[PDB]
Ligand binder design. Structure first.
Ligand SMILES: C#Cc1cn([C@@H]2O[C@H](CO)[C@@H](O)[C@@H]2C)c(=O)[nH]c1=O
Ligand SMILES: C#Cc1cn([C@@H]2O[C@H](CO)[C@@H](O)[C@@H]2C)c(=O)[nH]c1=O
Lengths: 308, 308
């Protein structure tokens, strides 16, 4: 039987302390790798200062200097750039991932999952009037299939403490935007409810009627974001093309494993929290003997080339 | 074990893919072969407004120099994301129904285009047109869904003079430059599958770049497009992130079953030519037994909602 792998995706909204936490966890250097955020790709390789381009566009939209449509085309392109290292990495990793599986051979810790750039952030900008809901569902359509052992760590942090940390940890080109903070915090909260809804037997088509008046309520999941008028026939029915994208979203999220990390503590308190959380995460076998070292290389090389 | 035949008619626009497809479906029955048309309705209305018209106008402005390459690029990328959405969800909802490769087929699905048209060929062609970055092309490439077994793709031959003629006959604008680009791109794609089925290996042949049947030279595959200065490290090699996107391209293309159809004939000519060619096409099984009418509903639903 092949070596076992543990994949761990540290996600949730920005500004809770997810970079310093795992930086602290980025400290044996051989049997566990930390794939950092592809900052260099964001600022240089894919495009010039993408983050700056994102926050400026939202701002200019806010000031009424540009229109909702202009802001959408810019936002949509940028989200393509933002997402690409997360997309390639997944594509090359996938063949190495086997079935589910006692300490593991290799632990991979990623800064974020593809659904950050393919679902969560697009959905947030939609709530911010800077992306059409059709684009969001286009990104959703391209969400890679959910491999086994997809453990996503999401954050818990009270809004005020979050604003504090966010203010002290602003990436280059970023503007402190409390409406975006609430957009993203709400998207990620809805995302956690969405996984519980799907796992408890939730069927979106069954409860879709309830958006008009032992699991969450559909109005508390991400499905509620797509009762958008753009997506709807004259008689209020969802177009089938959009409904199929919801079927996909449902399929992808139902099989991810969600773990909540309380960030409301000290940097190494978060670290220990992350280690405690691992005992419940799902390991997978790899698919070939030389999968472990191949994975290790991809990881170290991603780090070196696109890490901050 | 019921079986299925999926055939995707692709290639540059203005050849007769659509007519030929319809003639072909018109020979089966209202129960054993189904047309999946181009989602023209999605394109003009549902996903956005007059996307085809926005694409061709944007290119015209870039040419005319009324807009920068960058402004054209964000419009083209956004438009392309929209263009490809209905292909992406269709693939995603079909995938679980498709089994291993495998007499007559229970169902035949004739598609008007494959996902890679919107996720690769038109992006690459817009890149050659100077209205998309190579980075974004690779972003679309990295999002190409895993290639299902039994992926039969029918590209088209047609002399360029005859092709120009057909086009000049007919939301678009007569762009002969674009036609060269898209013809060249689909030419490379055909070569690229051939190059890959012949055990070709782009990493080992990369240094050879500057400027059925036998294995093509890499300079005559899609790989040639991505020796662009934006993609090259100080050392003159590709950045790994781009190399990995190219690995994905090879993995997606190598398993495809490519056929060429000659469009230098009459409509019924093409139909009978395409009908002959199907004889040598790979069928697959299906997973559930009730997969077949499920798949049938989905195609008629798609056609009814997004065709004309
Ligand atoms: C993933 C991701 C994304 C990150 N970001 C930004 O990148 C930085 C990552 O912390 C922040 O400025 C902000 C969260 C996006 O704007 N879009 C994304 O899709
Ligand atoms: C699929 C598809 C795509 C079609 N098109 C266009 O659709 C138009 C059909 O009228 C043609 O100009 C061309 C086929 C794109 O420009 N990009 C695509 O990705």
């Amino acid at each position: 039987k092949m070596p076992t792998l543990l994949r761990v995706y540290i996600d949730g909204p920005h500004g809770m302390g997810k970079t310093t936490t795992t930086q602290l966890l980025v400290a044996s250097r051989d049997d566990i790798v930390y794939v950092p955020e592809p900052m260099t790709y964001w600022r240089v390789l894919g495009a010039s200062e993408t983050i700056a381009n994102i926050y400026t566009t939202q701002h200019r939209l806010d000031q009424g200097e540009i229109s909702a449509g202009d802001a959408a085309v810019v936002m949509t392109s940028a989200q393509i750039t933002m997402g690409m290292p997360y997309a390639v990495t997944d594509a090359v990793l996938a063949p190495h991932i086997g079935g589910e599986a006692p300490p593991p051979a290799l632990t991979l810790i990623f800064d974020r999952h593809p659904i950050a750039a393919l679902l969560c952030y697009p959905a947030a900008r939609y709530l911010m009037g800077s992306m059409t809901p059709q684009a969001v569902l286009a990104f959703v359509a391209l969400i890679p299939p959910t491999l086994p052992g997809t453990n996503i760590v999401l954050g818990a942090l009270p809004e005020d403490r979050h604003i504090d940390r966010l203010a002290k940890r602003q990436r280059p080109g970023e503007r402190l935007d409390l409406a975006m903070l609430a957009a993203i915090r709400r998207v990620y909260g809805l995302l956690a409810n969405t996984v519980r809804y799907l796992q408890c037997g939730g069927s979106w088509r069954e409860d879709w009627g309830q958006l008009s008046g032992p699991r969450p309520h559909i109005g508390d999941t991400l499905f509620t974001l797509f009762r958008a008028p753009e997506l709807l026939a004259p008689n209020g029915d969802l177009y089938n093309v959009f409904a199929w994208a919801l079927d996909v979203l449902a399929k992808r999220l139902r099989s991810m494993h969600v773990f909540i990390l309380d960030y409301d503590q000290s940097p190494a308190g978060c670290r220990d929290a992350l280690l405690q959380l691992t005992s419940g995460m799902v390991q997978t076998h790899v698919t070939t003997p030389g999968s472990i070292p191949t994975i290790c290389d991809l990881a170290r090389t991603f780090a070196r080339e696109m890490g901050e």
